[model samples]
Target: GQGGGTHSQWNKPSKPKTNMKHMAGAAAAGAVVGGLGGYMLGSAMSRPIIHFGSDYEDRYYRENMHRYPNQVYYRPMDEYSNQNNFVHDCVNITIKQHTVTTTTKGENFTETDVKMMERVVEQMCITQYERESQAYYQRGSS
Candidate 1:
């Protein structure tokens, strides 16, 4: 009787399919929130700074190139020793926006754009800090 007994085989369950659509939707929502957050943060950070008119346009354009590279165009508004007095031009640049609109696209930077741009600016600042530190030490030694 034992030798003739029938045996049942155990079967493993199949793995569930990945929810790519759900993941993509979550990612998109996150991006929107992140963009809005970045915009708000920038506004908050710059609010306390002194308002020196639009004379600092060139400097601003150059400094903010990481955020609006193709968007902000620079043309010398005036030559002046005061950094606040110099001015430059800026524009919005968007490939999608351009194809749909008649007017020239300008730099309509989103929060996401600002966050990405800040990294470049931060690196530049770090380099400047190191350079200044080296110069300071050299001067002290001499």
Candidate 2:
């Protein structure tokens, strides 16, 4: 909902690409699993449900690999998987980096703009994670 004047409307924030309900679901599921078996079980169970597997290898690689393409190209499963076994975790880094790059090119940002950009990056990361998680859950459940 828009608050304040019409001018504020132009400054209105964008909704997260990831839905809150999915994140809630993920959190709830995580809590239940953690409660039953502790952090390890919860973590493990959460993995397959979040689409961090080879199923998303191509997409993940496409989004992430080429960013440092000249640096090195290691096996996704062996390298990237360990670094970001969770799809959301991977997306978080990618989104932040992308945002920083874009923002750097656009304007001479103030402290507030930098802070806001950080929040925006965080939101994007979470949303991306939620989206991948939901897709993973749907596929697995089906």
Candidate 3:
């Protein structure tokens, strides 16, 4: 057993979505299918064993979706999936990312004023978030 501020699994799976383009035709079909077969094999030679997917958003989205009365996840989005058909190699396109900072003064343990301040700051941060519009891109002519 280990006890410490251990960051054992700090890595996020940046799994590259597979694409098989049939423009060059047969070779393309073979490409994604080949990758899929490798994925099914399940190893370092293939793909990841787990897919956290949109849960990543659940980790940090609502906290910053921001609110006035109460904080909430306002910006809705689609999860990762076969968004479009017709190609080969694929990647995600990130359109926006915004980080904001806040200031808060609180009581020794707690106070309504302090609680309100924290809540407001959290909400304000969400309202201030520069959300992004990311999408999967592909090149299918191997």
Candidate 4:
């Protein structure tokens, strides 16, 4: 039996082995390119990032008192007198990530409603707002 045909695994033309060094270099280059690509894409597009953690709602309200402000926000106790309807600073703040979630039961604001939206909003502020603390507790429970 003469083993000289192309059917022999040892006689067939062998494919070249992959160069590990070249492969690693290519991977690193690809990562850089991909990261930059993602950055560019993010810049050109309205890609919004989101955050799940908040220090304002649960933390501030529970922690401070009369920290001081110009005037009443929605709630008299809210402290800060808002100029814009809180687009930048208040409840509807531009966060890393979140959406208008959760709601309170409210009747639609009409002439027949609870005077006006301001009145309702103010009441909500009073209910939800707290003054920043002028005094600090040593136990952190104040």
Across residues 17-133, which tens digit of lDDT does each residue of candidate 1 receive? 222322211123232111223221111111112232455643564454533322211222112112121111011212223222322344365554444333333333233332232
Angstrom error of the Cα, residue 71, model 2: value is 25
TM-scores for all predictions: 0.26, 0.28, 0.18, 0.18
Q: Model 1: what TM-score? A: 0.26
| Local accuracy by lDDT, each model | 0.28, 0.33, 0.24, 0.23
lDDT of 4 by residue, 35-114 (tens): 22212100011211222255553343223211111122221212232323322222212111111111123212223221
How high is the lDDT of residue 131 in model 2? 41
Candidate 3 deviation (Cα RMSD): 19.5
RMSD of 4: 29.8
Q: What TM-score does candidate 2 reach?
A: 0.28
- Of candidates 4 and 1, the better by TM-score: 1
Pairs with steric clashes in candidate 1 = 55-86, 58-88, 91-106, 91-107, 92-105, 92-106, 92-107, 93-106
Per-residue alpha-carbon lDDT of model 2 for 4-79, expressed as tens digits?
A: 2122211113432334343344345332211213112112211111233454543543343223201111122211
Candidate 2, residue 4: CA error in Å? 46
Model 2 RMSD in angstroms: 17.3
Q: For residues 17-126, write the lDDT of model 3, one tens digit per residue.
A: 33432222112323212212322110011111222255654433343334112221222112332212100011000000011112223213124323333433333323
Best by TM-score: 2
Task: Give lDDT for model 1.
Answer: 0.28
